Amino acid sequence: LELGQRPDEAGPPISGPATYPDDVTESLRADAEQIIARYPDARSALLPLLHLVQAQDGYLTPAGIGFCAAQLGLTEAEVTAVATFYSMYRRTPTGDYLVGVCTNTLCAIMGGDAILEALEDHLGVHPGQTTPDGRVTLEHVECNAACDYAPVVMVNWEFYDNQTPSSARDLVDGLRSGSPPPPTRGSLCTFRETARTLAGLTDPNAPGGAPGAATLAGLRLARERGMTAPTP
Amino acid sequence: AWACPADAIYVEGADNTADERYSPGERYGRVYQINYLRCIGCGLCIEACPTRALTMTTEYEMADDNRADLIWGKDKLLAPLQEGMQAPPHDMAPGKTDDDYYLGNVTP
Amino acid sequence: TPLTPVLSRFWDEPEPWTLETYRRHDGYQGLQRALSMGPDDVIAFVKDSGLRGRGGAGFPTGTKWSFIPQERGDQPAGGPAAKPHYLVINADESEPGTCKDIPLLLTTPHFLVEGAIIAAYAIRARHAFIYVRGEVLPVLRRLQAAVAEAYAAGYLGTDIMGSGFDLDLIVHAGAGAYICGEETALLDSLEGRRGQPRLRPPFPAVAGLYACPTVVNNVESIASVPPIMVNGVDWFRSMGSEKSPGFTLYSLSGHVTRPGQYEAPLGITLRELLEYAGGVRAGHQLKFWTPGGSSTPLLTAEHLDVPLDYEGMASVGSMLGTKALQIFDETTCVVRAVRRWTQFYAHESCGKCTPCREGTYWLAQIYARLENGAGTEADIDKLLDISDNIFGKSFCALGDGAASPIMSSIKHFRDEYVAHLDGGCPFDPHASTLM
Amino acid sequence: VEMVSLTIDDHEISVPKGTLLIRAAELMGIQIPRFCDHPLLDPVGACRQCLVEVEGQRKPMASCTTTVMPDMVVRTQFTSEAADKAQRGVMELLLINHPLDCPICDKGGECPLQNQAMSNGRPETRFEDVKRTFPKPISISSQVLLDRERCVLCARCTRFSSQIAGDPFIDLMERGALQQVGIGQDK
Amino acid sequence: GDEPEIIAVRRGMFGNRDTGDTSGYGRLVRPVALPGSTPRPYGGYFDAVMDRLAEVLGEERYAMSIERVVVYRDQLTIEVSRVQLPAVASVLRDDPDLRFELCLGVSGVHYPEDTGRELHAVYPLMSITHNRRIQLEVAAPDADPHIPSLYAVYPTTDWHERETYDFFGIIFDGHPSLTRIEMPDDWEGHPQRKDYPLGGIPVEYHGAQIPPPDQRRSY
Ligand SMILES: Cc1cc2nc3c(=O)[nH]c(=O)nc-3n(C[C@H](O)[C@H](O)[C@H](O)COP(=O)(O)O)c2cc1C
Ligand code: SF4
Ligand code: SF4
Ligand code: SF4
Ligand code: FES
Ligand code: FES
Ligand SMILES: [Zn+2]
């Protein structure tokens, strides 16, 4: 009959393994119980729950959609509608690191477009495509609210501030290779680890996250020029 | 047929498919009859047609002894298969698409 | 005016995000001060403070809180019990150029948590949610850690500070969508639906999350609460002006030396902020800039001295927005920047309503033609006509935000837009790259 | 049966409390263009086709969603040039991505889009750019064929399948210009 | 009354005559009103005509005879009251200031949805001396389709009044002989009435047939 979208179309429709094995669903339900228990309404836990299935695979698949529908009593259509709406729910097997150059107006014009072009030419892949080594998946992301840290390069949703194109290619080489340079502001972890973190399950005590230069510039200038909060 | 004041055109559409394609695009006129004992030669059909598939020739000789012989079907009306043309049931010209046909960007 | 470190005060300290570091500087004192006062007392206390909402709109925080229909009286709800109130904190910060909430959350998230608790008390909401955009995973980790610490220290849960108050706080990690930042879209996304805006009415005050009363506040508007609690209303009012008092974070970014967050009183002029930052990138001049994020109409040199406050921006037609202060100089092409913004809006549109969904697509294509060789003089008039057809007509304000860059850019640089008809963008992208 | 009186265009009428502007304008004989509105569906105001100028309101208001208040004044495209401009612009934006499919579209002749583009549309295209395109048609069941390019994304199908029938097996999917009515994967 | 005549009440958008092919569009109620009486300063010679008429007739006779005055597209219609038609026509023809010598005929028009006013006879009159023209309109019910014949005033009407009867059944009482002129004397029904079916036959085609236009859908 050919029901549903054609497989080769737009951003790839949710496709992949039709269902998870028994034990996989056992673990998924074990985590989903905790995810559901924290909301006044079951459906409220859909966005976390989707991350959880995106944590099981490298990307959303029909199996994840089915599990979320079964847990929340929804239809696969409603779950798909919610899932396809948000960009963070990748729809292709994602590499060990999702490297997204912020191509927004400011970051791009501050140099981000050069970052993205250089990375695309170096990795040999276009944004949204995974490297054959399966370690990096390039992307171009909208504003990440790190505009001060211009040409910001995002990696597994950690920050890399003030990235030059050379710095960007060094960073992607490090990621595809064994050891990557640390995030300028954040603690890097594998993509599936980030998925479990967005689900609210990862241990939040991970190190890193110093203020950095831009977050302080104002306070530094105030101190160097004797400014302060006036007084009670 | 919509525009014909005399209800002298009968058209049934049908789907074009890869196994059998008669026109560019999703629809084609599988059945196309003109009842020339109802056609008044007004020409509104022509002005109605959006593809120029329907034209009016200058050929006029027509008369028959049967009421039914003057209900001319699709196979009587289709223009002669000019040189460079192939049989109607075939895929579009390679790489071309219905838009390429309507813009006139097609050749044998 | 001078910078005024209030939230930025703690930063540059060792691991300021910790609860010990926060306590060392009058942390969670404001929560106690509020908890001593009556809920309506706290609402009035904030309302007198003004504290206009720091996320986009600028609506007074106090009135927004008061609109929640408190039972009050003698507790006469003998029939259908009053449905629970909710405090959904909007930690989503997706407006382009807007990077004030993220640093605040990462460095000293407790300002929020504290304030959030206070806000929950003010509206008497038994539950509170901090909807924080994903893609800031460091910030999400910081915020989860802060909330866990708050639970450990008895500031969240039940019998908070022995006030009889109970409050459970949840950090919801939103997936990727700019539109989720709007109230009633934040709510649908938190309810596990497509992050699309709802109708209004019914407003969130009467029926928001789960059709129950809700108040959505930007993280800046909340984290500004503990300061006014501890330092009083009079301290807050000394800053800014009567029609827009207080302090705000300004995310100086773009072609500027020393970009970063500057905590300054409302009404600080861009001249003063550039002087503090040291001015635009050396050797170039301010060409254009956005007071708020991209959602706000562009500004140019002729407004360098116009105050950065709600009334001041309304005085020029721009909206203060989120105090993003994106800065661009001679090297940048207005058409190029506006094209990228239109691309962002087309990508981030929820698609719900015809004006935004279709017009943003069309404008993105028109700008693509402009930047490329194609493009005609009639194309500028078409851009303006389409923007007019989007502005006001779109279901939510995202359409207005999409139209604003286009309309302001044409109004200020029709000359450059025309010059782009010569065969494309004359500018060389390499020249604008913060090296 | 509290009756609220209001003037639509120049004329005046009185209608039950809570009646929508579009319903009142129907009752008084005025065809406000509309796609997403449906009397039996909860109003959604999505397509923005039904905009009208309302006294005291800066923005045009979707007549399909504007509950009638006492003493309101409203001016449709028949008397408000601003409302006319709003509706015509929405119509244009509605047609730019629409396929040139009328001869092959089954809805041809009975299409509300055709009729309301005649009554409330510009004479000719202003859109010289590239239209959005989907592979079409695609079956969402054994019975129903979906043509996403022609979809004006009014959500009436989805809103019906949720509100009227408890069968949300289609929904609006994807985002932005790419939004499309769809079934889950193959269900 | 000054309220217009509604000859039909369209239901729903797009001119659907029935439920409609798309749901939710059928709730509009658009009455089909002909133009109402023109306010007073009728354009051009129309005032000059009507005033003169109002002078030749009395105030009472004028008010009882002329039911309405409708100027539309610079064409003057005098919706005259039944029974009084011969008097008004005589005044128009005879009065030197009006002197509408030439009555161009009579045309029936059927409005089944106009209560008590189903059948309208239209009399185009022209005054050659004054180079003027107007249209009288006399409305009669379906149950009492009788109208006074103008034969004594306009002999030209005799055939027209006949055709109009044949086609509508408007009984011009006082006409010498209202025999059918177009249709056979034994013909049943009055074809130009809407109630009369079009009486077509399906058009034949190889393997199919098209029903007449009155059966197939319309908008
Ligand atoms: C498209 C759109 C996106 C928005 N995104 C945000 C956002 O990311 N963060 C934010 O604080 N406000 C955002 N807003 C403004 C919200 O209205 C605001 O968060 C909420 O109403 C509370 O505002 P307040 O805290 O200033 O009182 C957005 C508004 C629109 C229309
Ligand atoms: S000429 Fe064409 S339109 Fe006219 S009656 Fe004949 S078939 Fe119909
Ligand atoms: S303007 Fe309309 S389409 Fe755009 S984001 Fe808002 S609701 Fe969605
Ligand atoms: S398919 Fe659904 S959303 Fe699209 S036009 Fe039809 S009813 Fe509207
Ligand atoms: S412009 Fe890229 S993070 Fe804001
Ligand atoms: S019919 Fe009202 S907005 Fe669509
Ligand atoms: Zn350019």
PDB file of all heavy atoms in Angstrom, chain D residues 22 33-37 44-51 62-65, ligand 6:
ATOM      1  N   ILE D  22     -17.287  34.984  13.533  1.00  0.00           N
ATOM      2  CA  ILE D  22     -17.533  34.391  12.227  1.00  0.00           C
ATOM      3  C   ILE D  22     -18.951  33.849  12.153  1.00  0.00           C
ATOM      4  O   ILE D  22     -19.621  33.966  11.122  1.00  0.00           O
ATOM      5  CB  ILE D  22     -16.479  33.313  11.927  1.00  0.00           C
ATOM      6  CG1 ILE D  22     -16.423  33.041  10.425  1.00  0.00           C
ATOM      7  CG2 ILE D  22     -16.771  32.051  12.709  1.00  0.00           C
ATOM      8  CD1 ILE D  22     -15.078  32.565   9.946  1.00  0.00           C
ATOM      9  N   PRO D  33     -13.834  35.025   4.698  1.00  0.00           N
ATOM     10  CA  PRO D  33     -13.089  33.857   4.225  1.00  0.00           C
ATOM     11  C   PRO D  33     -12.533  33.058   5.388  1.00  0.00           C
ATOM     12  O   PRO D  33     -12.160  33.606   6.425  1.00  0.00           O
ATOM     13  CB  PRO D  33     -11.973  34.472   3.376  1.00  0.00           C
ATOM     14  CG  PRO D  33     -11.789  35.818   3.943  1.00  0.00           C
ATOM     15  CD  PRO D  33     -13.156  36.277   4.333  1.00  0.00           C
ATOM     16  N   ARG D  34     -12.492  31.742   5.213  1.00  0.00           N
ATOM     17  CA  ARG D  34     -12.132  30.866   6.316  1.00  0.00           C
ATOM     18  C   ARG D  34     -11.723  29.512   5.773  1.00  0.00           C
ATOM     19  O   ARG D  34     -12.342  28.992   4.844  1.00  0.00           O
ATOM     20  CB  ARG D  34     -13.302  30.694   7.281  1.00  0.00           C
ATOM     21  CG  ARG D  34     -14.343  29.731   6.765  1.00  0.00           C
ATOM     22  CD  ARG D  34     -15.670  30.008   7.391  1.00  0.00           C
ATOM     23  NE  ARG D  34     -16.218  31.255   6.883  1.00  0.00           N
ATOM     24  CZ  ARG D  34     -17.503  31.570   6.906  1.00  0.00           C
ATOM     25  NH1 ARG D  34     -18.404  30.748   7.410  1.00  0.00           N
ATOM     26  NH2 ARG D  34     -17.891  32.741   6.412  1.00  0.00           N
ATOM     27  N   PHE D  35     -10.666  28.955   6.354  1.00  0.00           N
ATOM     28  CA  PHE D  35     -10.294  27.580   6.061  1.00  0.00           C
ATOM     29  C   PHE D  35     -10.278  26.741   7.325  1.00  0.00           C
ATOM     30  O   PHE D  35     -10.925  25.694   7.386  1.00  0.00           O
ATOM     31  CB  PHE D  35      -8.933  27.529   5.385  1.00  0.00           C
ATOM     32  CG  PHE D  35      -8.942  28.079   4.008  1.00  0.00           C
ATOM     33  CD1 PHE D  35      -8.653  29.404   3.782  1.00  0.00           C
ATOM     34  CD2 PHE D  35      -9.258  27.278   2.941  1.00  0.00           C
ATOM     35  CE1 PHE D  35      -8.669  29.917   2.516  1.00  0.00           C
ATOM     36  CE2 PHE D  35      -9.274  27.782   1.673  1.00  0.00           C
ATOM     37  CZ  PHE D  35      -8.980  29.107   1.459  1.00  0.00           C
ATOM     38  N   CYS D  36      -9.538  27.186   8.337  1.00  0.00           N
ATOM     39  CA  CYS D  36      -9.364  26.367   9.525  1.00  0.00           C
ATOM     40  C   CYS D  36     -10.607  26.346  10.392  1.00  0.00           C
ATOM     41  O   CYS D  36     -10.813  25.380  11.129  1.00  0.00           O
ATOM     42  CB  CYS D  36      -8.168  26.860  10.336  1.00  0.00           C
ATOM     43  SG  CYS D  36      -8.472  28.322  11.324  1.00  0.00           S
ATOM     44  N   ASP D  37     -11.443  27.371  10.310  1.00  0.00           N
ATOM     45  CA  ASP D  37     -12.657  27.392  11.105  1.00  0.00           C
ATOM     46  C   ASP D  37     -13.546  26.211  10.760  1.00  0.00           C
ATOM     47  O   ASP D  37     -13.576  25.748   9.619  1.00  0.00           O
ATOM     48  CB  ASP D  37     -13.425  28.682  10.869  1.00  0.00           C
ATOM     49  CG  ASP D  37     -14.766  28.672  11.547  1.00  0.00           C
ATOM     50  OD1 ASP D  37     -14.847  28.164  12.681  1.00  0.00           O
ATOM     51  OD2 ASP D  37     -15.749  29.145  10.946  1.00  0.00           O
ATOM     52  N   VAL D  44      -9.483  27.044  16.298  1.00  0.00           N
ATOM     53  CA  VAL D  44      -8.028  27.005  16.387  1.00  0.00           C
ATOM     54  C   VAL D  44      -7.368  28.252  15.835  1.00  0.00           C
ATOM     55  O   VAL D  44      -6.216  28.544  16.195  1.00  0.00           O
ATOM     56  CB  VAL D  44      -7.480  25.747  15.675  1.00  0.00           C
ATOM     57  CG1 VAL D  44      -7.677  25.845  14.177  1.00  0.00           C
ATOM     58  CG2 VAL D  44      -6.026  25.540  16.005  1.00  0.00           C
ATOM     59  N   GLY D  45      -8.031  29.026  14.980  1.00  0.00           N
ATOM     60  CA  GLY D  45      -7.449  30.252  14.474  1.00  0.00           C
ATOM     61  C   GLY D  45      -6.110  30.083  13.802  1.00  0.00           C
ATOM     62  O   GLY D  45      -5.296  31.007  13.833  1.00  0.00           O
ATOM     63  N   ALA D  46      -5.857  28.927  13.192  1.00  0.00           N
ATOM     64  CA  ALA D  46      -4.531  28.637  12.665  1.00  0.00           C
ATOM     65  C   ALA D  46      -4.275  29.390  11.371  1.00  0.00           C
ATOM     66  O   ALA D  46      -3.329  30.176  11.272  1.00  0.00           O
ATOM     67  CB  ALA D  46      -4.374  27.135  12.447  1.00  0.00           C
ATOM     68  N   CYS D  47      -5.116  29.174  10.364  1.00  0.00           N
ATOM     69  CA  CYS D  47      -4.814  29.672   9.033  1.00  0.00           C
ATOM     70  C   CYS D  47      -4.820  31.189   8.948  1.00  0.00           C
ATOM     71  O   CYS D  47      -4.271  31.736   7.987  1.00  0.00           O
ATOM     72  CB  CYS D  47      -5.803  29.097   8.025  1.00  0.00           C
ATOM     73  SG  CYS D  47      -7.393  29.918   8.004  1.00  0.00           S
ATOM     74  N   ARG D  48      -5.420  31.883   9.910  1.00  0.00           N
ATOM     75  CA  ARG D  48      -5.488  33.340   9.906  1.00  0.00           C
ATOM     76  C   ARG D  48      -6.182  33.887   8.669  1.00  0.00           C
ATOM     77  O   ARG D  48      -5.954  35.035   8.287  1.00  0.00           O
ATOM     78  CB  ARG D  48      -4.095  33.967  10.014  1.00  0.00           C
ATOM     79  CG  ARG D  48      -3.221  33.407  11.107  1.00  0.00           C
ATOM     80  CD  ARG D  48      -3.879  33.499  12.458  1.00  0.00           C
ATOM     81  NE  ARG D  48      -4.048  34.876  12.892  1.00  0.00           N
ATOM     82  CZ  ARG D  48      -4.705  35.232  13.985  1.00  0.00           C
ATOM     83  NH1 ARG D  48      -5.253  34.335  14.783  1.00  0.00           N
ATOM     84  NH2 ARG D  48      -4.822  36.522  14.280  1.00  0.00           N
ATOM     85  N   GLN D  49      -7.027  33.095   8.016  1.00  0.00           N
ATOM     86  CA  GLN D  49      -7.689  33.585   6.815  1.00  0.00           C
ATOM     87  C   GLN D  49      -8.813  34.549   7.155  1.00  0.00           C
ATOM     88  O   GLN D  49      -9.144  35.428   6.353  1.00  0.00           O
ATOM     89  CB  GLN D  49      -8.231  32.415   6.000  1.00  0.00           C
ATOM     90  CG  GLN D  49      -8.913  32.820   4.715  1.00  0.00           C
ATOM     91  CD  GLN D  49      -8.010  33.611   3.808  1.00  0.00           C
ATOM     92  OE1 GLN D  49      -7.078  33.071   3.219  1.00  0.00           O
ATOM     93  NE2 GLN D  49      -8.281  34.899   3.680  1.00  0.00           N
ATOM     94  N   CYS D  50      -9.399  34.410   8.340  1.00  0.00           N
ATOM     95  CA  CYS D  50     -10.648  35.071   8.689  1.00  0.00           C
ATOM     96  C   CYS D  50     -10.441  36.355   9.472  1.00  0.00           C
ATOM     97  O   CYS D  50     -11.262  36.688  10.334  1.00  0.00           O
ATOM     98  CB  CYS D  50     -11.525  34.112   9.486  1.00  0.00           C
ATOM     99  SG  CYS D  50     -10.950  33.879  11.167  1.00  0.00           S
ATOM    100  N   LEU D  51      -9.365  37.082   9.207  1.00  0.00           N
ATOM    101  CA  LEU D  51      -9.064  38.264   9.996  1.00  0.00           C
ATOM    102  C   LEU D  51     -10.078  39.366   9.731  1.00  0.00           C
ATOM    103  O   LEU D  51     -10.559  39.536   8.608  1.00  0.00           O
ATOM    104  CB  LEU D  51      -7.655  38.748   9.681  1.00  0.00           C
ATOM    105  CG  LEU D  51      -6.580  37.727  10.041  1.00  0.00           C
ATOM    106  CD1 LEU D  51      -5.230  38.171   9.531  1.00  0.00           C
ATOM    107  CD2 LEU D  51      -6.539  37.508  11.537  1.00  0.00           C
ATOM    108  N   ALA D  62      -8.768  37.076  14.380  1.00  0.00           N
ATOM    109  CA  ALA D  62      -9.376  35.945  13.697  1.00  0.00           C
ATOM    110  C   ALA D  62     -10.843  35.868  14.084  1.00  0.00           C
ATOM    111  O   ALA D  62     -11.175  35.522  15.220  1.00  0.00           O
ATOM    112  CB  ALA D  62      -8.645  34.659  14.062  1.00  0.00           C
ATOM    113  N   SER D  63     -11.726  36.193  13.143  1.00  0.00           N
ATOM    114  CA  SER D  63     -13.149  36.191  13.451  1.00  0.00           C
ATOM    115  C   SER D  63     -13.611  34.828  13.936  1.00  0.00           C
ATOM    116  O   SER D  63     -14.578  34.738  14.696  1.00  0.00           O
ATOM    117  CB  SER D  63     -13.950  36.609  12.226  1.00  0.00           C
ATOM    118  OG  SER D  63     -13.616  35.801  11.118  1.00  0.00           O
ATOM    119  N   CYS D  64     -12.947  33.759  13.505  1.00  0.00           N
ATOM    120  CA  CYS D  64     -13.356  32.434  13.936  1.00  0.00           C
ATOM    121  C   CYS D  64     -13.098  32.202  15.414  1.00  0.00           C
ATOM    122  O   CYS D  64     -13.695  31.291  15.994  1.00  0.00           O
ATOM    123  CB  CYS D  64     -12.643  31.367  13.109  1.00  0.00           C
ATOM    124  SG  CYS D  64     -10.892  31.180  13.439  1.00  0.00           S
ATOM    125  N   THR D  65     -12.230  32.995  16.037  1.00  0.00           N
ATOM    126  CA  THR D  65     -11.876  32.783  17.433  1.00  0.00           C
ATOM    127  C   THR D  65     -12.291  33.931  18.337  1.00  0.00           C
ATOM    128  O   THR D  65     -12.162  33.813  19.559  1.00  0.00           O
ATOM    129  CB  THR D  65     -10.369  32.579  17.570  1.00  0.00           C
ATOM    130  OG1 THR D  65      -9.707  33.843  17.472  1.00  0.00           O
ATOM    131  CG2 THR D  65      -9.863  31.678  16.484  1.00  0.00           C
TER     132      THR D  65
HETATM  133  S1  FES F   6     -10.729  30.441   9.734  1.00  0.00           S
HETATM  134 FE1  FES F   6     -10.116  31.775  11.370  1.00  0.00          FE
HETATM  135  S2  FES F   6      -7.922  31.729  11.299  1.00  0.00           S
HETATM  136 FE2  FES F   6      -8.565  30.127   9.940  1.00  0.00          FE
END
